[model samples]
Target: AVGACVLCNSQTSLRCGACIRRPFLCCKCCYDHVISTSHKLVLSVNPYVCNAPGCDVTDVTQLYLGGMSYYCKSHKPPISFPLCANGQVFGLYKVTDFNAIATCDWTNAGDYILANTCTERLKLFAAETLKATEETFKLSYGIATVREVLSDRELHLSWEVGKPRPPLNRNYVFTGYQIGEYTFEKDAVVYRGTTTYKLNVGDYFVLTSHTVMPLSAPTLVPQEHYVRITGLYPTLNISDEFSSNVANYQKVGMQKYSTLQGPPGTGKSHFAIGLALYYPSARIVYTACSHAAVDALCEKALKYLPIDKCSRIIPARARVECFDKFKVNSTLEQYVFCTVNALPETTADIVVFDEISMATNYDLSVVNARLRAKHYVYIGDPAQLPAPRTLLTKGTLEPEYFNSVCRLMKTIGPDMFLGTCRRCPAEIVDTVSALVYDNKLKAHKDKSAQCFKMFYKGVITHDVSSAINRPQIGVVREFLTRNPAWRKAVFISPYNSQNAVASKILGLPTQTVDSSQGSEYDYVIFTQTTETAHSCNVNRFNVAITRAKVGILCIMSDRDLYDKLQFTSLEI
Candidate 1:
C-alpha cells in the first residue's frame, strides 16, 4: 500500500489510494495502466486527523472550520453554529491553486491583504467546479458562497432595506449582487438575514428546498463541494479557424458565463471548438440536440484540438467514430468519453450545447442541468427553432422558456450575435437575415454561380413518413453537378426518407433538419415536404435555406407552404 500500485513498485505518493487501502500510482503509471476515471485517489503528504477526540479518523478528507483544524461531520460544529452559518458573514479560509504552489492570500493577492481588521470588507467570489469531488472550504474572501431564503407572503425587496440597512455593521455588503429580502411581519426574526441573492444560474446555485425557503423559516447550505453550469464560450471568431477575431478575454482562475446566438451560417460551432483548443487545461463537455450533432462536433474538434494537451472530444459514451475519425490516440491518457449523466467523471470546465434551437426545456433540464463547468457556453439561434413540442408541453416550466439560449439571456448575459456571415451569399442570407436584423447584415456570396430557384412543376411530395420525392432528387443532383465546388453543397430534407433519397442520389451528407442545426454548407437543395410538417416551422425553414452559402434551390412538394415563400423573391 505504501508503494506505487503496491504491485507496480513505483514511487507511491499516497498512504494508499482508496476506496481505502488501495495502492497509489505515479502519474505515468496511473495513465499507462487500467486505472479508470472513477477510481478515487489521495495525495495528502501529511497525516490528517478528524477532531472528534475519540474518533481519531486519520487522513480522511473532512470538513474544515474557518479555523485551521479539520473535523468529521459527527463531531464538527452544527449548521446553526455562529460561524459558517448565515449569509451575513463569510470566512477567509485557504485554498490551493492549479499549480499546487503558492497556497496564497489570493492568486498573487499580496500578504498586505490580511491587515487584521474586523471591518475590512473584503470581496467574495466562487470557484469553478471539478465534478463535486473536492470539498474545498478555503475561507478566503472573493472565494465565497452566497445563500438566502424566501417566502410567498413577503413583499420583501432590497429597496426597502436601503443605506441605513439591517443590524449588520456594514453598508452595501451584498450590494451589487442580489440578496433575497425578508417578507415576514417586520423583523419577525429571520434566520441568517437575507433570503436570496441576485445570482445567475451559470455560476453555481444549489437551491433545493433550502434556498427557496423563507428566512422566517431558516435553512443552511451544506457546502457540498458545489455544482457548476453547463459550459462557457470565452471567445467567438467569425472567419474560418485561421482568420477569426479572437475575443481578448482571459478565463483563468475565474468562473465565467456567456450566451452566444447567430443565424444558421455564422459558424457558432467553429468558434466554440477554437475556444476549447485555446484552453486545453480546462476540462470541457460537448453536447448537442442530437447524438449525430454531437458526433459531428466531436469530429470538428478532434481535427484541430491539440493531442498533447488532452484536447480530445469524447463522445457521449463510446461512439468509436469520434475517436476513429479524428485519429485520437488512446495512449495520450484521456481518450475516455461519457453520457451527460457521467459528466462528473470528465470534470469539464466548459459544456457546449450546440443546436439549442432543436432542444426543448426538458432536454436542458435533464441533460444540460447535469453539466457543470467554470465557464458555461450555450450556442444557438432561437429564431431558428424552438424546443420540441413534446419537451415544452410536459415540463413545469413554460413552453417559451424551453429555448435554452433564452433561459440564460435574462439573468446571465445578453444575446451575443456573431459579427458576420462567411457561409451564405447576399441573395440567400438576406432571406434568413430577417430573423437577426435589417441593413442587409453584411455578407459576400461565394464565387460559385447558381441562381436561387424554386420548382412546383413535377415536384414530388414527401415528409417524415411520406414517400421520397423522386423528381426533387434529380433536381438536386443536376444543380450540384452543373455547379460544383467539390464539397460546396448539402441536401437538406426534414424526413429520413428524403434524407436517404438525397444521399443515395447525390452521394453527400444528408441530415435530418434538426441534426444539421448548428452546421452550414455552400448550396442548399431544400425539399419542402409540407406546410404542416414540423420542419415547416419558420425557424426550421430558415435553417434549411441559409445553410447554403452561395445559393439555394427549393423544390416545393406542397403549395400551401410555397405561397409564403414569395417574400424571398421566390418563383417557380
Candidate 2:
C-alpha cells in the first residue's frame, strides 16, 4: 500500500496521510518528516458539498481540496467543529436559510479563504469565522428569531434558533425587517420555551463571521531605533524663566524631583521642550499613562527636532516593517528622540511625564524603580479627572488631590505654577476658575468669534431611575439640528448606558470625562443623565466644562441635579 520512506530511504507501513505522494513513510519518518516540513495530516480527494442535504455545492470544498472536513455554506454542527477540519468550515453564506454561496475570487489557503473579489457589504459569515481575504467583510452575522420584546429597544432572541449567538457588543445584521446592523447588549436566558438574548426587537436575518489568521512562520525584520530623536536645541535658547531653575537643578546634581504645575494650556509642552534643550545630549525619556498623552508631547517635540534625532519608541516585537511605503507589513520610520510608556528595567538621563495627573501610586512606584534618570519632571493639572480605581477603594485615596505626583510636588516643594488660561475663551476660563481654581487662574485675552451658552429646563417630578435621559437627548438633538455648524462637537457623559443610546440616536462620538482628559475640542455638549451628584464630582465637572475651546452646552436631566452642581456662571 505504500512506497519507500522519503526521509530514511526505507520501506514504510504508512503512506502520506494527506495526499498520495512519493514520500510514503515509516512510523518514525511520519513523525520526523512533519517536524521538518510544512505539512500536516488528513486527505480525501472527494469534492465537498454542504452537509445540509440537497445543497449540492461542490466548489465549497475547493479551498480544502484534499483534507478532512465538515460543514459548508451556512451549515454548522450543533457543537464546535473539530480542529482537524476547522479550516474547511464554510459557515457564512448568502440567504438566511443556507441557500446561497458567496460568489467570489477566493485564495484558498486550505485553512482560510481570501474573499478578494467580494463587495463591501455582502453578508459573509453565519458566526465568527476565519477571514477569507484582505478586504474587511461585514461584521454582523446570523439570523435571530425573536422570542420576546421589551422596553428601551430591548428585543429577545432565541439562542438555539439560529447560528451561535455572538458575544456582547457585537454587531448583528438584520434585513427586510429592520434593514440595518445593531449590537448585542445583554446575555441569553433559557426561558420556559427557548434561550433568549436581549437586543433590538426586529425580525433578524443574515449575520457575520470574519476571522484573520496569524502568520505560519516567523520572518526577519530590519534593524531600527527603539525611539527616534528629531528636534534641535541651540545652547543659547534657554529662557530666563527656566534658566535659573535649570541651572539650580543642574548644580544640585539634578537630584530631588521637581514639577511644572501646568493648568489647562499654560505652555507646559513648551516647558518640556525647554527642559529637553537644557540637556540636548542627554538621553531623555518622555512618557505618560495614555498613548494619546505621550504622542501629544512627542508631536510637539518633532516641530523643533531634525530627522536624525527624535523617535517614538516601539518595542521590537511590534515592529512590522522598516519603511512605511512598502506593502510587506505595517509601515515604520525610526527617529532619534523617543516617547514610550513607563518602561521597566530602563535607564534615561531625564524622565519627564507630561500628564502625571493620571498616574496612580502603584504606577509611579513601578516606573520610578525602573527609570534611573538625573532629573524627573511631573507636569499636569490636578484639578482634572482622577485616576481610575474601583468604588470599593473610593475615598481611600483622592488621586486628583493626593496622586503620587501631587504628593511628591508637595513634599519636594520645588515647582513652578503655570497660571495662564491660553486655550479656553475668557468666559469658560472664568467659569472654570470660579468652580475649581478659586479664581486664581486668569484667562489670556482671546479674540474668538465663538461664544458660550447653556440651556436649562424645569421638571415637576425629579426621577433618577433611568440612565438614558430622553429629555436631554431630545434637547441635544434639537440644538445640534438647529446649529449644524457645530459638526466637530462631541457628546460627553459619565454613564456608558447613556453613551450607547446617545451615540446610536444622535450619531455623535461619546466619552466620559476620564477618557476625554488631555483632549480639546471646538464644541462640547456635556450631558448628565444620572441624578447622583457624587457622579459629577468636582474633578469630573471641571474636566467636562473645560474641554471645549470655543463653546460648550450643558444638558442635565434633573433640575435638582443641576442646582446641586451650583454652576452659577452657566446661566445664559
Candidate 3:
C-alpha cells in the first residue's frame, strides 16, 4: 500500500521530487493532491503584528477559521525573533501562534495567556470594581449598607436605603462584585467580608462580579373569610348586604370579615378579603366547606394582596399550618379554618358559607351558634342544590331537620336573592338558570332559543363494550381527533362507577359527582350500566343536564332509561 501508484492503486508507483525517499511526505502529497484538487478551494491571507509593549514582529500564516483558510507572512524576522514585539517573550508568541496555527497546541497556549491577562486586569481594578458594584447594587435593589467584612460563613446586611425596610421579601438583587477576600467555587465566587446580609424567609440574593444584589421579595396571600347569612335585613338589597356588613364591622372597629354568596364564581371569597383590607388591623377569619375550597380561595386572595406584605404575614410555618387550619395572630385570632368541627367556640366574627344549600342541619346549627359578631351571610343558589336524599341519608340526618329549617326560614323572613348572574354569557345563564330554577324567577324567553342555537350539531353514536373488552388506548385519541374541544362535552353514567369508565373512554380526568363537584362541558355522553336501579332519582340527571353552560348533546344506548323519566315543571 505504501508504494502503490496514486492513479492506478498499484504497488509500482513513481514518487514526486518533493516526496522521493520520504514515505510520510509521499502520503501527504497524495492526500493533498487528490483531496484538494477534487474539492473547490479559495485562498486568503490573515496577518498579525506582535502586540507586546516594546518588541516588534509581524507574521502572516495559513490557517482555517470555519473551514476557510488564510495565509499570513511578514517582511522580516527580527533579531532573536524580536521577542514577538511583546513585554514577555512567551506572551507575544502565544498571540502570534494562536492566529497562525490551526492545532491544539496553539489553542491551549492562547487560552492560558488570555486567562492570565484577565486575572491581572481584575487584580488592578479589584477595589474600584467592588465599590462600584456595591453602590449600584444597593441603589437598584434598595439595600441599606455594604459592610466590608460580614463574617466567616454568614453575611450581616441591613437596609440603609429605600422605603422603610420593605417587607423581608421586598428587596431585589440585581448585580454582584468581588471584593478583597474572595474565593472561587467552580462558576461562582464566594465573598468573605464584614458585610452581613439578612434576608426574609422568601427573599433571595443574586451575586455578580463579587457584589450581592436583591431579586424578588416574599408574597402574602389572604385567607378566605366565612360569612353566615341567617337573614337579609329587609332595607338592604343583595349587594347592599355585602356593603352593610362591611360598614357595620368598620363602625365597631372590626377589621377582618367578608360576606357574599351563591355559585362557585360569585365572588363570595373575594368580597371577604376586600372587607379585610378595608380595615387593615382586623384579623380576617376564613373558613370553607372543604380543604380544597379553602386552598383555592387563598390562592385567589394572594393575587389581591401585596407580595412582600403577604410574605411577612404568612410565614413558611404558617403556610404549612394553612393546610388544615391557621390563625394569623395570637391576640386577634383571625382564623383560617376548613372542614373542622364547627363548634360555637371556633366561630369567627364574620362567616361566609359557600354552597349553603348543601349544608347539613348540623353544619347550620354549629355555624349559627358560633356567630360572635352581628353579621351572618349565606350564599347559595337553591336551584343548584345537590341530591337531597344523598345529603340526608349519607349524612345520617333525620328528615325532620330539613322540613324544620325550610319551615323556620320561611316563617322568619325572605332570603336575599342576587339579581344578576355574571359568569356565563347572559343568554346562556338565563336559560340554564331558568331550567335549573324552574320558572320561579323571570327569565328572558330568548335565552332558550339562544342556547339551542349554539348546540353542537354533530351526530353522536354509542358503542358499548364489556369491562374486559374495552377499546384500545387510542380510542380517546380517535374521538378527540374528530372532536378537539372535549371541554365542551359531558360524560354521564347510569351508575357512579361508570363515570370513571366513561372518563377513561373519553380520555378525561376522573371526577366523582358530589355536592361540591361539577364541570362545564359542551356534549353529554351517557354510559348506561346494569347496576343502575329504578330507585335512582332525577338528581344525577339534573346535575348532568345543568353542566352544559352553552348547550348539551346526549349520547345513550338505552333510550328507554331516559324515556321513563318524568319531566318536572320545577326550574332546576
Flag regions of model 1 displaced more than 4 Å: 1-255, 277-281, 289-291, 311-320, 325-342, 346-348, 360-372, 385-399, 408-415, 435-441, 446-449, 455-489, 499-510, 533-535, 557-572
Question: What local distance difference test score does each model get?
Answer: 0.44, 0.50, 0.34
Give RMSD (Å) of candidate 2 vs. truth.
18.9
Task: Summarize candidate 1's per-residue lDDT along 353-414 as a digit string, tens digits.
Answer: 66665663334444434544455556776566553332111223321343434545533544
Worst 10 residues of 1 by lDDT: 212-221
Q: Using alpha carbons, what is the TM-score of model 1?
A: 0.47
TM-score order, best first, reads 2, 1, 3
lDDT of 2 at 546: 73
Q: If both were scored by TM-score, which would come out higher, candidate 2 or candidate 3? A: 2
Instruction: Residues 1-572, candidate 2: write the lDDT tens digits.
Output: 53444334465434434322223444454444333343444222322334456765433222221234545435555553332233222221101111111222223221111211121111122011223322233332345666666544455676444344443332222332433344454334221211222344455544433343222111111112222222222356665756644643342233445667677876777777666566566566667766567667766776654435555654443312122211221112222222233254566666677677676433454456556655566778777765543211223233323444565444454257777878887767776777667687888946344543444442312223325566677777887877787656888876655666778788988876677787888888877665555445766777776777877777764454354443332332
Across 1-572, the per-residue lDDT of candidate 3 in tens digits comes to 12433322333222322211111112222333323322111111222233334534332112112222222223332322331122211111122221111111212323222221232222112212223333443334343343433344434344445444322210122322322122111011223322333322223233333432211111001223335322222222234435635543343232232322233234445555555554443333444444454555556456654432321123221212343222332323453434323223443444555544455333444454444443444444444443233111122222122221222233442144333443333444444454443433332222332122111112222223212112321333344565555544555443333443455566554332342243445444333333222113233444444454443333322344234322211110
Please give each candidate's TM-score: 0.47, 0.52, 0.39
**Which residue runs of candidate 3 sit more than 4 Å off their true CA positions?**
1-267, 270-283, 305-335, 342-347, 368-371, 386-414, 425-431, 438-481, 487-494, 515-552, 556-572
RMSD of each: 23.2, 18.9, 31.4
